[PDB]
Amino acid sequence: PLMVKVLDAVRGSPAINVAVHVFRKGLTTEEEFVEGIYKVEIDTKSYWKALGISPFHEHAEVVFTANDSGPRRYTIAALLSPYSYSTTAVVTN
Amino acid sequence: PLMVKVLDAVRGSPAINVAVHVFRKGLTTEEEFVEGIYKVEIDTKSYWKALGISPFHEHAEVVFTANDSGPRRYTIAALLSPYSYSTTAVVTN
Amino acid sequence: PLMVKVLDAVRGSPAINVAVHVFRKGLTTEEEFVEGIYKVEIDTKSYWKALGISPFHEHAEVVFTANDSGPRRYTIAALLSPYSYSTTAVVTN
Amino acid sequence: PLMVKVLDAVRGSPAINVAVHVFRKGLTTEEEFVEGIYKVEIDTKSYWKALGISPFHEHAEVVFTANDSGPRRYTIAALLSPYSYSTTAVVTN
Amino acid sequence: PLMVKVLDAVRGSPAINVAVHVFRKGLTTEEEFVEGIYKVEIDTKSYWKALGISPFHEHAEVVFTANDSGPRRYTIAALLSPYSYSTTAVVTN
Numbered sequence: 499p500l501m502v503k504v505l506d507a508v509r510g511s512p513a514i515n516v517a518v519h520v521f522r523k524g525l526t527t528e529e530e531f532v533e534g535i536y537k538v539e540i541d542t543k544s545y546w547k548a549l550g551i552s553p554f555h556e557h558a559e560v561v562f563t564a565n566d567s568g569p570r571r572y573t574i575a576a577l578l579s580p581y582s583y584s585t586t587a588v589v590t591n
Numbered sequence: 592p593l594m595v596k597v598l599d600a601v602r603g604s605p606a607i608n609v610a611v612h613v614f615r616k617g618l619t620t621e622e623e624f625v626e627g628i629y630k631v632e633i634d635t636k637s638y639w640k641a642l643g644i645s646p647f648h649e650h651a652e653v654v655f656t657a658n659d660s661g662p663r664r665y666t667i668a669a670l671l672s673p674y675s676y677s678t679t680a681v682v683t684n
Numbered sequence: 685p686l687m688v689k690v691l692d693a694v695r696g697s698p699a700i701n702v703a704v705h706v707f708r709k710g711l712t713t714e715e716e717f718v719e720g721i722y723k724v725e726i727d728t729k730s731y732w733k734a735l736g737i738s739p740f741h742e743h744a745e746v747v748f749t750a751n752d753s754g755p756r757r758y759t760i761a762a763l764l765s766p767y768s769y770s771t772t773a774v775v776t777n
Numbered sequence: 778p779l780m781v782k783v784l785d786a787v788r789g790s791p792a793i794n795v796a797v798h799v800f801r802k803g804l805t806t807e808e809e810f811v812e813g814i815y816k817v818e819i820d821t822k823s824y825w826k827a828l829g830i831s832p833f834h835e836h837a838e839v840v841f842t843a844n845d846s847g848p849r850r851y852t853i854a855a856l857l858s859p860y861s862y863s864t865t866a867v868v869t870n
Numbered sequence: 871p872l873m874v875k876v877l878d879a880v881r882g883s884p885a886i887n888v889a890v891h892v893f894r895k896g897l898t899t900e901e902e903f904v905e906g907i908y909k910v911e912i913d914t915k916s917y918w919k920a921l922g923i924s925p926f927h928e929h930a931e932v933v934f935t936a937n938d939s940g941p942r943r944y945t946i947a948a949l950l951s952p953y954s955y956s957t958t959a960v961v962t963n
Contacts, residue, residue, distance in 0.1 A: 502892055504597045504876045510883040511603045511675040511696075511768060513952065515629075517610045517889045517907055520595060524620045524713075526920055527896040530903075531623075534630045535610060536671060536887075537906045540944075541913045542635045545657060548619055548920045549642045550711075555924055558647055561654045561933045564917060567940040568660040568753065572633075575679070575960050576672035578908060579948035580606065580765070582883040584677045584956045586947070588668050591684045591963045597690045603883075604696045604768040604789075604861060608722075610703045613688060617713040617806075618922075620896075624716075627723045628703060629764060634727045638750060641712055641734045643804075645741055653746045660940065661753040661846065665726075668772070669765035672952070673699065673858070675883060679772045681761050690783045697789040697861040701815075703796045706781055710806040717809075720816045721796055722857060727820045731843060734805055734827045738834055747840045754846040758819075761865070762858035766792065770863045774854050777870045 513580035525551070540572055606673035618644070633665055699766035711737070726758055792859035804830070819851055885952035897923070912944055 504518055517535050526548055545564055554560060575586045597611055610628050619641055638657055647653060668679045690704055703721050712734055731750055740746060761772045783797055796814050805827055824843055833839060854865045876890055889907050898920055917936055926932060947958045 500593045500872045500894065502595045502874045503878055504888070504890060505880065506596055506599045506878045508598065508601045508605065508880045509603060510881060511605050512880065512883050513606045513673050513675045513885045515608045515671060515673065515887045516597070518597060519612045519891045519904065521614045521893045522593065523616045523895045524618060525896060525922055526619045526898045528621045528900045529623055530901055532612065532625045532904045534627045534906045534909070536629045536908045538631045538671065538910045539635050539914070540633045540911065542632070542911050543915045544637045544919065545639065545917045546919065546921065547637065547640045547916070548922065549639065549925065550618060550646050550922045551644045551924065552648055552927070553642065553646045553922050553925045554651060554930055555645070555648045555927045556650065557928065558651045558926055558930045559653070560931070562935065563655065564657045564936045566659045566938045568663070568942070570661070570663045570940070570942045572665045572944045573960055574667045574670055574946045575958060576669045576948045577946055577950065578670065578887060578910065579672045579951045579953065580885050580887065581672065581674045581677055581953045582885045582955065583675070584953055584958065586668060586677065586679045586958045588666055588681045588960045589962065590682065593686045595688045599689055599692045601691065601694045601698065602696060604698050606699045606766050606768045608701045608764060608766065609690070611690060612705045614707045615686065616709045617711060619712045621714045622716055625705065625718045627720045629722045631724045631764065632726065632728050635725070636729045637733070638731045640730065640732065642732065643711055643734065643736045643739050645737070646735065646739045647744060648738070648741045649743065651740055651744045651746070653748070655748045657750045659752045661756070663754070663756045665758045667760045667763055669762045671763070672765045674765065674767045674770055676768070677770045679761060679770070681759055681774045683776045686779045688781045692782055693786045694784065694791065695788045697791050699792045699859050699861045701794045701857060701859065702783070704783060705798045707800045708779065709802045710804060712805045714807045715809055718798065718811045720813045722815045724817045724857065725819065725821050728818070729822045730826070731824045733823065733825065735825065736804060736827065736829045736832050738830065739828065739832045740837055741831070741834045742836065744833055744837045745839070749841065750843045752845045754849070756847070756849045758851045760853045760856055762855045764856065765858045767858065767860045767863055769861065772854060772863065772865045773868065774852055774866070775868045
């Protein structure tokens with residue numbers, strides 16, 4: 499006998515993010531998993547990954563260069579931060 | 592006997608994001624999984640990935656260059672942040 | 685016996701995003717999965733991927749260049765952030 | 778015996794996005810999956826993908842250049858953010 | 871007999887992020903796991919990863935350079951920090 503109760507009774511006006519998981523029971527492998535439920539990614543970069551089998555196996559001449567030299571402005575008042583009866587703002591002048 | 596109850600009773604005007612998962616029971620592989628439910632991606636970049644088998648196997652001359660040198664402005668008042676009886680705003684001048 | 689109850693009773697005017705999943709039981713492979721339910725992607729880029737088998741196998745001369753050097757403005761007051769009895773706005777001058 | 782109940786009773790004028798999934802039980806492969814339910818994509822780009830078998834196999838001379846250098850303005854007051862008895866707006870001057 | 875109760879009764883207008891997990895019971899491998907529930911990633915970069923089997927096996931000449939030399943401003947008033955009856959703001963002049 500398994501019983502799960504979440505927020506069974508609520509009165510008012512909340513601000514909520516919820517996540518509920520229940521469970522009874524090659525080069526890159528992944529199995530029987532949960533990922534990236536409330537995930538957030540910003541300026542996330544992956545240059546090389548899982549190129550493959552026998553790459554650049556013989557007499558390979560390679561030049562790898564990576565430049566992230568840029569003017570970038572990321573502004574976020576609230577991130578994964580629910581709020582209630584409050585005040586949020588972003589202002590620039 | 593499995594019972595799950597979420598937000599069974601609510602009174603008012605909330606602001607909610609919900610996620611409920613229940614469960615009874617090659618080069619790149621993935622199996623029996625959940626991903627990217629409430630995921631968010633911004634400026635997310637993947638240059639090379641899973642090119643394949645035997646790439647650049649023999650006498651490969653390669654020049655890899657990556658430049659992210661740009662003026663970019665990402666402004667987000669609320670991200671995955673539900674709200675109630677509140678005030679949000681983005682202002683520029 | 686499996687029972688799932690979500691938001692069984694509601695009174696008022698909420699603002700909700702819901703996701704409910706229930707379950708009883710080659711180069712790139714994917715099987716028996718859920719993905720991208722409430723996903724969001726902005727400025728998401730993938731230059732090379734899964735090119736194929738034996739690419740650039742022999743005497744390959746390659747020049748790879750990537751430039752993201754641009755004026756871009758992404759403005760988002762609310763993202764995956766439902767709200768109630770509130771006020772949101774985007775203003776520019 | 779499997780029973781699922783969602784929003785069984787509602788009184789008022791909410792604002793809702795819902796997703797319910799129930800389930801009893803080559804180069805690129807995908808099987809038995811759900812994807813892109815409430816997905817959103819903006820400025821999403823994929824230059825090369827799944828070119829094929831034996832591409833550029835022999836003596837291939839290649840020049841790859843990618844430029845995203847443009848004036849672009851993406852403005853979104855509400856994204857996957859339902860709301861109720863509220864006020865949203867986008868203003869420019 | 872297993873019973874779990876969370877936020878069974880609530881009165882008011884809170885601001886909440888919730889995560890509940892319950893459970894009864896190749897080069898890179900992952901199995902039977904949960905990851906990235908409320909994860910956040912900013913300026914997260916992975917240059918090389920899981921290149922593959924026998925890469926640069928013989929007489930490989932390689933030049934790897936990585937430059938993160940850029941003007942970048944990341945401003946975040948609230949991150950995974952829900953709030954209530956409060957005031958948050960981002961201001962620039």
